[PDB]
Scaffold this active site. Structure first.
Site, PDB file in Angstrom:
ATOM      1  CG  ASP A  38       2.830  13.455   9.777  1.00  0.00           C
ATOM      2  OD1 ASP A  38       3.083  14.412   9.020  1.00  0.00           O
ATOM      3  OD2 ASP A  38       3.174  12.289   9.514  1.00  0.00           O
ATOM      4  CG  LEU A  74      -2.092  -1.064   1.021  1.00  0.00           C
ATOM      5  CD1 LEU A  74      -3.001  -1.035   2.266  1.00  0.00           C
ATOM      6  CD2 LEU A  74      -2.879  -0.773  -0.230  1.00  0.00           C
ATOM      7  N   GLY A  75       2.013   1.228   0.603  1.00  0.00           N
ATOM      8  CA  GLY A  75       2.902   2.380   0.604  1.00  0.00           C
ATOM      9  C   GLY A  75       3.958   2.310   1.694  1.00  0.00           C
ATOM     10  CE  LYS A  76       9.283   0.732   1.472  1.00  0.00           C
ATOM     11  NZ  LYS A  76       8.236  -0.329   1.383  1.00  0.00           N
ATOM     12  CE  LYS A 111       2.952   2.990  10.632  1.00  0.00           C
ATOM     13  NZ  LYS A 111       2.468   4.273  11.244  1.00  0.00           N
ATOM     14  N   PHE A 115       9.192   5.491   8.164  1.00  0.00           N
ATOM     15  CA  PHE A 115       9.537   4.611   9.278  1.00  0.00           C
ATOM     16  C   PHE A 115       9.089   3.160   9.070  1.00  0.00           C
ATOM     17  N   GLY A 116       8.264   2.913   8.058  1.00  0.00           N
ATOM     18  CA  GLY A 116       7.725   1.568   7.848  1.00  0.00           C
ATOM     19  C   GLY A 116       6.814   1.473   6.639  1.00  0.00           C
ATOM     20  CB  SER A 117       6.379  -1.117   4.198  1.00  0.00           C
ATOM     21  OG  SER A 117       6.585  -2.289   4.964  1.00  0.00           O
ATOM     22  CB  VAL A 118       0.961   0.361   4.835  1.00  0.00           C
ATOM     23  CG1 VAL A 118      -0.410  -0.196   5.238  1.00  0.00           C
ATOM     24  CG2 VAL A 118       1.423   1.448   5.832  1.00  0.00           C
TER      25      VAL A 118
END
Ligand SMILES: Cc1cc(Nc2nc(N[C@@H](C)c3ncc(F)cn3)ncc2Cl)[nH]n1
Length: 278
Positions: free
Chosen positions: A128, A13-15, A38, A16-19
């Site tokens: 954020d 799904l996307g990128k 996550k 501190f960590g990936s999903v």
């Protein structure tokens, strides 16, 4: 209490960590719901501790406009959340701008406002706020969707001192690393700005701030010139088609004076009211 061997990988799904998007299929037939997963990529000891607090923050929230916590998974802590099918608000708005009117933009605004109002009652600071961090559930509902930089205020003070998303940051956050409900309101102002730009690329807060500073500025001078700019009441401009009354809300959110910024309660009522006049 999710077993790692029952999470079947569907896509990133996307990128501190990936999903990742996975199907939890505990009976190992072919049924079971899709979920969002996550994890941290190369987890340093400090990152794990922060991720563990992220989980407890998310687990502690129950609200219509906050993404739903489902569980955790150890083999490599993984956080399991509900899958929201329309993606980030930033992407949804780009994809479907032709179908989204100002009334719809203010339906979203209002829901982000209600979610933040609820966070404030938990004494949580998001840090954020940005359309990239809002998820779309359906045409009528958005959810605050990531809490990776979120902090709990200490018991006895009304702020908390800690690449940052500097173009969404309040002045006191840039100069003193001080975060509060008031600095979430600043960033909210930037969120409302993003929305009424409809994410037209050259109207993003980075592009605009870089032009106002000068596109010649690189590396570490950027933040210094931004602080200067904001101190001299430099501001993101009114988006094309943004009504006066809406830009006034943005400009009020972007007050150098922390205490004069409005509350999320105030913001939600005014936006709702503007929505009805339309
Ligand atoms: C927790 C979660 C993510 C989703 N769904 C999607 N997520 C993403 N990207 C991730 C990185 C993302 N996470 C959080 C966020 F605020 C924005 N974007 N792209 C498309 C979809 Cl559909 N459902 N639930």
């Amino acid at each position: 209490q999710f077993e790692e061997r029952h999470l079947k990988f569907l896509q990133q799904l996307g990128k501190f960590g990936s999903v990742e998007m996975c199907r939890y299929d505990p009976l190992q037939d072919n049924t079971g719901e899709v979920v969002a997963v996550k994890k941290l990529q190369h987890s340093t000891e400090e990152h794990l501790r922060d991720f563990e607090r992220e989980i407890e923050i998310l687990k502690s929230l129950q609200h219509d406009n906050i993404v739903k916590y489902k569980g955790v998974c150890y083999s490599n802590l993984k956080l399991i959340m509900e899958y929201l099918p329309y993606g980030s608000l930033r992407d949804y708005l780009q994809a479907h701008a032709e179908r989204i009117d100002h009334i719809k933009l203010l339906q979203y605004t209002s829901q982000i406002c209600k979610g933040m109002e609820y966070l404030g009652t938990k004494r949580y600071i998001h840090r954020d706020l940005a359309t990239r961090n809002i998820l779309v559930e359906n045409e009528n509902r958005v959810k605050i969707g990531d809490f990776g930089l979120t902090k709990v205020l200490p018991q006895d003070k009304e702020y908390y001192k800690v690449e940052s998303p500097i173009f969404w940051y309040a002045p006191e956050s840039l100069t003193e690393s001080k975060f509060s409900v008031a600095s979430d309101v600043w960033s909210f102002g930037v969120v409302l700005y993003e929305l009424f730009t409809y994410i037209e690329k050259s109207k993003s807060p980075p592009a605009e701030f870089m032009r106002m500073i000068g596109n010649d500025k690189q590396g570490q001078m950027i933040v210094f010139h931004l602080i200067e700019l904001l101190k001299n009441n430099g501001r993101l401009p009114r988006p094309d088609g943004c009504p006066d009354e809406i830009y006034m809300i943005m400009t009020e959110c972007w007050n150098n004076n922390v205490n004069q910024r409005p509350s999320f309660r105030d913001l939600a009522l005014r936006v709702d009211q503007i929505r009805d006049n339309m």
